[PDB]
């Protein structure tokens, strides 16, 4: 009942980072403190890693196991967006704002950062555990994918949105909003596929799947807290970001058909403010007036 409308929405949202000129951010970037620039680079690098694995591994593997040519076409399109559009856009931002050495250093930093490695290990592990014709392993990977789309990106998204909302780094911010618009529909779509599998189960099996989903969320959440503190303490924003990730965790649960897990909190209003032509042939009557 939904794939065709997701297909149409995904293809109509198609974009490339080159559509957005980035040289306009040069001055507001220059004006940020060293702490702010450091957090910003690292935040986008963490996002790049997530999209790299979502594009290389997550979306293609889910596409392989989901039945139906139209469902596969949507998932293939989403996979392309992850690595050919999203992951690449971050390099466009980096290449504009930062010198090569700072770019090299931040990519080295992703390799050695323990929270980023842990979250990649956990998510990719679940993707690679999918067994052919085994719907339960597939469900588990789809939960992981929804948590990546609708929860894990958000510790990263906070900062570009926080600046966009203050009228700073608005070109980079425009790219990020386009990425976020895509991930929101990706999380909903994968969520609907996960619910399909969940709804086939006995009540006993469902109870176990909820346990899996909640245990996984808590494990990812605890790691994300440490990651958030590590990045944001130097810019004074860790508590604010934590509220934001809890907000988005609830959205991820909802995408999976589950009740919200965290209590509602006031999000920084700045971040809330951060949120060919048709052709006809010529008739013989068009030549006369």
């Amino acid at each position: 009942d939904f794939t065709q409308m997701f297909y149409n929405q995904n293809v109509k949202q198609f974009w490339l980072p080159e559509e957005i000129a980035l040289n306009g951010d040069l001055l507001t970037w220059k004006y940020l403190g060293k702490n702010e620039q450091d957090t910003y680079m690292k935040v986008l690098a963490g996002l790049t890693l997530l999209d790299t694995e979502q594009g290389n591994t997550g979306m293609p593997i889910v596409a392989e196991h989901v039945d139906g040519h139209q469902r596969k076409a949507v998932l293939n399109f989403m996979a392309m967006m992850e690595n050919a559009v999203h992951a690449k856009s971050y390099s466009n931002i980096f290449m504009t704002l930062a010198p090569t050495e700072t770019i090299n250093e931040v990519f080295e930093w992703v390799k050695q950062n323990k929270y980023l490695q842990k979250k990649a290990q956990m998510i990719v592990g679940l993707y690679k555990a999918i067994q052919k014709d085994d719907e339960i392993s597939l469900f588990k990977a789809m939960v992981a994918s929804v948590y990546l789309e609708s929860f894990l990106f958000y510790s990263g998204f906070y900062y570009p949105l926080y600046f966009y909302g203050q009228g700073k780094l608005m070109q980079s911010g425009e790219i990020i909003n386009l990425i976020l618009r895509d991930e929101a529909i990706h999380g909903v779509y994968v969520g609907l596929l996960a619910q399909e599998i969940y709804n086939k189960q006995t009540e006993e099996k469902k109870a176990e799947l909820r346990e899996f989903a909640i245990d996984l969320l808590n494990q990812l959440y605890e790691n994300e807290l440490e990651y958030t503190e590590d990045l944001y303490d130097q810019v004074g924003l860790s508590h604010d970001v934590k509220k934001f990730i809890r907000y988005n965790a609830n959205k991820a649960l909802m995408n999976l058909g589950f009740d919200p897990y965290f209590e509602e909190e006031d999000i920084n209003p700045i971040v809330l403010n951060g949120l060919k032509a048709t052709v006809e042939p010529l008739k013989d009557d068009d030549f006369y007036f």
Binding site: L27, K276, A277, T278, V279, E280, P281, L282, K283, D284, D286, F287, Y288, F289
Partner: protein, 683 residues
């Protein structure tokens, strides 16, 4: 954020459900109380100012030496006696950011509006203090505005040429192609926009010295020209702008058009080279009847007939080309080509469309040559003769390359002063002076055609502004009636001034005797059709001004027969990009694109309402995109019937309309006599 910028952005803040337009005026005051006066260099007297500007290589000594200092001081006093005030912030901002003379360090303002106007007037008069005062009164009343080159550079030592529209003919040879590249580079160095006709160039797959499939076509020449224009970019100030025109019956026409497709490869697409397509009536007839057309190889036609394909009338030559076995041709679908043109214009606004027969059925100088192509702005339509640039140590055959002189009447200011005749004649005199003082030593055909043809372009602007401030819709029949009458008077007084200059100097333009002015054919429609307003409102608008009748046109025809005409071409309506801001006018005769335009300068936002915009005339200031393009075509044709050259005619389309609608607008423009179509701007 500066105070004037806050006062300007306060326009959008609505009070009582209305825009605070008057706040803009306050912004101007701030822009002068806080910035302009603080950063304006002041001198104890005008003598010290002139000495400082001349000594520091800001001005030229020659034009100031023609007057005594008392006369220059009197001209400056006449300029300052008006007490001119910019009515909007954007007018003063555009003048003092683009045209006001600044120090070498670009931190101080040496020229006010009155100073620049006085200097331009003194340059125009060429030693006549009374003529200089007349020019000062013309420009300080803002009745006439010299083009951006003339207005910016007149009287300045560190300057480019006063002409920025250049049309080059390229002959089918490597020597001619290299010379065209060189001349394009030299003219872009001077700051001019260069248009090149590539129809004489043989298509891809033609023979060079009887070896087959050797020619790269016009696309390789376009790549060379694009590189030349990228290299020559006004000493790294503005992006080098060039245009290439190809006849639609040239075989490369698809590849030509393929240079503007987004999917085109890096070795195919040209980015800084605008493209225009010349469409003879034969192509429109073939598309209308759905008969398959033929695109011809120019070199085979040249070998068979001894003349270039674009040098003969395709209406009478097309059947002979098709039936000639020695003429090589390729089958095409003209309707498919029209759809491709419409699609390309939807994507990028390219190509410019030139309706060859629409231009040449009213062209007065067809004996010299038929108009084969237009300029970068698609409004200059003049006879051109190709040059034969031979090898070294061999004499070149220098032809005629078009370079007309731009200047725009402010229709609102001209008509409220009831001074159509005086403004037109003074503008013609100033354009003649600038054409006579132009000497380009690296473009031989441009210089020869400037000396011979003496062609000038006198345009008009603020048509929509004048109509909206007078309670007239741009698409109304009353607006077309006003345009008809006003531009017929403009043509009448331009012809009268040209004939008066010819009588005074005793010389006409070269080959005038063969022109329709000499034979009296040009005046036919003027000696039989009365162009007085048909509506009482327009007649009351023209009250206080003598409207030339058929008897007056007969007298003018007799005067031209007796004395000749000094200018081969007189009127062309240019887009008038930035000078419309300084004059507080709507651009060209085009309808306004937006009622209030939002611009970003530096990291600041600014708001420019259209001149005279208020609550009472908000509805009359209809946006161009909301207008019916057929009625815009009707108005542009009404104006074009009184303009010897073309009008920069931009189409304003909505994203909803398809390529069929664009093609319908183009075909209605062709039917209504539109000479050129400039751009297809999609909202």
């Amino acid at each position: 954020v500066p105070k004037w910028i806050q006062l300007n952005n306060e326009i959008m803040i609505q009070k009582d459900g209305k825009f605070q337009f008057d706040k803009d005026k306050e912004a101007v005051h701030s822009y002068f109380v806080d910035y302009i006066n603080q950063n304006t260099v002041f001198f104890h007297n005008l003598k010290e100012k002139l000495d400082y500007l001349v000594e520091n290589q800001y001005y030229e000594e020659e034009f100031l030496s023609l007057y005594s200092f008392e006369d220059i001081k009197e001209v400056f006093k006449t300029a300052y006696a008006k007490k001119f005030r910019f009515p909007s912030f954007m007018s003063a901002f555009k003048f003092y950011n683009d045209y006001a003379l600044k120090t070498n360090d670009k931190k101080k303002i040496l020229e006010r509006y009155e100073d620049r106007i006085s200097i331009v007037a003194l340059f125009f008069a060429n030693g006549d203090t009374e003529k200089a005062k007349e020019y000062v009164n013309l420009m300080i009343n803002q009745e006439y505005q010299p083009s951006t080159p003339t207005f910016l550079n007149a009287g300045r030592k560190r300057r480019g040429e006063l002409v920025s529209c250049f049309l080059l003919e390229v002959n089918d040879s490597l020597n001619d192609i290299s010379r065209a590249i060189d001349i394009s580079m030299q003219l872009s160095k001077l700051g001019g926009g260069v248009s090149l006709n590539l129809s004489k160039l043989r298509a891809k797959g033609e023979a060079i010295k009887d070896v087959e499939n050797a020619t790269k076509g016009v696309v390789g020449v376009m790549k060379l020209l694009d590189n030349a224009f990228r290299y020559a970019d006004q000493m790294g100030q503005r992006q080098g702008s060039g245009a290439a025109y190809l006849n639609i019956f040239h075989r490369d026409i698809n590849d030509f058009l393929d240079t503007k497709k987004i999917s085109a490869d890096e070795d195919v697409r040209v980015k800084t080279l605008s493209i225009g397509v010349v469409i003879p009536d034969k192509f429109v007839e073939l598309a209308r009847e759905d008969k398959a057309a033929y695109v011809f190889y120019p070199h085979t036609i040249y070998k068979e007939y001894g003349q270039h394909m674009d040098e003969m009338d395709m209406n009478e030559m097309y059947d002979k080309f098709v039936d000639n076995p020695r003429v090589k041709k390729e089958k095409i679908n003209p309707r498919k080509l029209l759809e491709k043109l419409a699609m390309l214009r939807s994507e990028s606004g390219y190509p410019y469309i030139m309706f060859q027969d629409n231009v040449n059925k009213v062209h007065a100088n067809n004996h010299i040559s038929k108009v084969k192509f237009s300029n970068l702005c698609s409004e200059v339509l003049q006879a051109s003769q190709v040059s034969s640039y031979t090898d070294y140590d061999e004499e070149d055959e220098i032809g005629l390359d078009i370079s007309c002189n731009l200047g725009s009447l402010n229709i609102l200011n001209v008509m409220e002063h009831k001074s159509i005749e005086k403004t037109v004649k003074l503008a013609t005199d100033s354009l003649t002076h600038v054409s006579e003082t132009t000497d380009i030593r690296n473009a031989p055909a441009v210089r020869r055609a400037n000396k011979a043809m003496k062609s000038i372009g006198l345009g008009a602007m603020n048509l929509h502004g004048y109509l909206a401030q007078n309670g007239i819709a741009y698409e109304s029949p009353e607006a077309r009636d006003f345009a008809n009458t006003f531009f017929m008077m403009v043509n009448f007084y331009s012809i009268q001034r040209s004939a008066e200059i010819a009588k005074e100097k005793g010389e006409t333009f070269d080959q005038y005797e063969g022109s329709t002015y000499a034979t009296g054919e040009y005046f036919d429609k003027y000696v039989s059709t009365d162009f007085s307003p048909k509506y009482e409102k327009i007649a009351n608008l023209f009250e206080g001004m003598h409207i030339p009748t058929t008897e007056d046109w007969k007298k003018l025809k007799a005067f031209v027969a007796e004395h000749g005409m000094y200018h081969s071409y007189r009127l062309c309506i240019a887009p008038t990009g930035s000078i419309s801001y300084v004059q507080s006018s709507t651009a060209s005769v085009m309808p306004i694109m937006e009622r209030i335009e939002e611009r970003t300068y530096g990291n600041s936002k600014t708001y420019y309402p259209m001149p005279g915009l208020a609550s009472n005339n908000w509805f009359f200031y209809k946006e161009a995109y909301d207008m019916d393009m057929f009625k815009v075509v009707d108005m542009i044709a009404t104006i074009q019937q009184h303009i010897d050259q073309g009008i920069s005619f931009t189409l304003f389309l909505k994203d909803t309309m398809t390529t069929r609608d664009l093609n319908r607008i183009d075909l209605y423009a062709h039917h209504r006599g539109i000479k050129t179509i400039y751009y297809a701007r999609t909202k």
